[PDB]
Amino acid sequence: CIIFFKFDPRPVSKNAYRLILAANRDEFYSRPSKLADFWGNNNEILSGLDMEEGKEGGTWLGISTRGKLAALTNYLQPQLDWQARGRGELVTHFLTTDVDSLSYLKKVSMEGHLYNGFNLIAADLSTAKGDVICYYGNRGEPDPIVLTPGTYGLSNALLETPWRKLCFGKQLFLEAVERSQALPKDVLIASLLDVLNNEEAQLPDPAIEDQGGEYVQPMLSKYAAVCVRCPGYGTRTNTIILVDADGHVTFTERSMMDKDLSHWETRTYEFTLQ
């Protein structure tokens, strides 16, 4: 997975964005998934959904019209614990409850040992009260942190770990944002989709080799790109989320269909934060 986001809770100008987020979901192509649409008790949550039997309703990335947003990446490991709790519930539980992001991540931190490795971003979006974004991962430090305004990247190590693909992707992301600055949002979205589909591998990467051990050796030549193309495994979903200064949200999700590299469906939804 890879996620880039620029957050600016106090935009200094009227056309500035409070949030620009661009994310790839990398997963085995066999894992059933539902394309993004609104769900929940008052149709207030927008996300794709995991449909693996026994884990239905989990997700990796979502936003609610009440101003909650969360995102998860897996931590790369040489081996997994199959009796562990599924990580898909971590985003879902934040989006469906009424807990602030830092309080929620503190609760998660007390339970992090029950999951395989993960990284979690949780955000409270409020036009009136100011946006807050927090971070916790169960393979790093035990206390969640409140992030300062800036542009962040997160892949399958920790927040801002300098994997070459993360640094390269962050530079492309910054360039695309700067380039589509004054322009209509369709141009920004198109530029970010192009970043997320960059297949240029960034090698050698001894950090990936060290963390992934034997598991990653046969994947390394393709895993070290922003857009991952391995046998039966890789970038299946590109998601862009924009929140402008006034709280208007644009959510764009491009999904691989029929397990086919030439078949894609992209959905864009708009709403205003309540």
From Swiss-Prot:
Question: Which GO annotations describe the biological process of this protein?
Answer: Golgi organization; protein secretion
Family membership: Belongs to the Tango2 family.
> Result of mutating residue 73 to P?
In MECRCN; uncertain significance
Main subcellular localisation:
cytoplasm
Outcome of mutating residue 88 to C, per the record? In MECRCN; uncertain significance
Role this protein plays: May be involved in lipid homeostasis.
- Where does it sit, as one GO cellular component term? mitochondrion
Q: What is the species listed in this Swiss-Prot or TrEMBL entry? A: Homo sapiens (Human)
Tell me where on the tree of life, at the top rank, the source sits.
Eukaryota
Q: What is the effect of changing residue 25 to K?
A: In MECRCN; uncertain significance
Keywords assigned: Cytoplasm, Disease variant, Golgi apparatus, Mitochondrion, Neurodegeneration
Designated name of the protein: Transport and Golgi organization protein 2 homolog
